[PDB]
């Protein structure tokens, strides 16, 4: 039953990202542990990150991103439309086509 273990894996990733969002305001290092555990789970079980989570951590430092607290989010659309996200903890900039 590979199907069960892939199911469990996703539920674990989902749990840990949900907890990182809940704790990040108060203990950013705990949130960072949750994010990194989730990624280690993801590559051990060879599953995908739920779409709602995949832009919510810094790909450089693994901080969980709270827009307005430890992250700057802008919509930039005058030329090539994109979302620009800056991790205020390491300064890494992530851009996604809009």
């Amino acid at each position: 039953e590979k199907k069960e273990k892939k199911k469990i894996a996703i539920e674990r990733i989902d749990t840990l990202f949900t907890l990182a969002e809940r704790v990040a305001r108060y203990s950013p290092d705990l949130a960072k542990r949750y994010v990194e555990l989730a990624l280690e789970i993801q590559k051990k079980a060879k599953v995908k990150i739920p779409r709602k989570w995949k832009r919510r951590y810094c790909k450089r430092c693994h901080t969980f991103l709270i827009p307005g607290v430890n992250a700057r989010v802008r919509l930039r659309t005058k030329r090539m439309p994109h979302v620009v996200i800056t991790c205020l903890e390491c300064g890494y900039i992530m851009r996604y086509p809009y």
Binding site: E4, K5, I8, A9, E11, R12, D14, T15, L16, T18, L19, R22, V23, Y26, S27, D29, L30, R33, Y34, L37, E40, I41, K44, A45
Partner: protein, 105 residues
């Protein structure tokens, strides 16, 4: 030990765990974010402590209730709370291993 920021803030954990956890599958699932009570332990001061599991290492669960407790797995018996409020009872021995390493068996 960045656990102290959670004291007084455990309400943040309510509704956060997203798995359906059973007595069969708890061995493979996320223990972090589950409410737990310790029903038995070799160390007298651990019996009766309740809180959320906030971290896990190979033979230890970090629990936040009224204070932070580091409780070892192998000498303890745990009553975890699933999402419907039913209880899962299991010897900590069965949970020994790093959280990532527990995925297989």
């Amino acid at each position: 030990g960045s656990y102290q920021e959670i004291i007084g803030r455990t309400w943040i954990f309510r509704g956060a765990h997203r798995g359906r956890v059973t007595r069969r599958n708890i061995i493979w699932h996320e223990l972090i974010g589950l409410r737990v009570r310790i029903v038995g332990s070799t160390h007298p001061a651990f019996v009766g402590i309740e809180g959320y599991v906030i971290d896990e290492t190979r033979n230890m669960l970090v629990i936040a209730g009224d204070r932070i407790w580091k409780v070892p797995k192998d000498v303890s018996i745990f009553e975890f709370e699933a999402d419907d409020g039913t209880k899962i009872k299991i010897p900590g021995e069965r949970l020994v291993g790093r959280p990532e390493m527990r995925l297989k068996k």
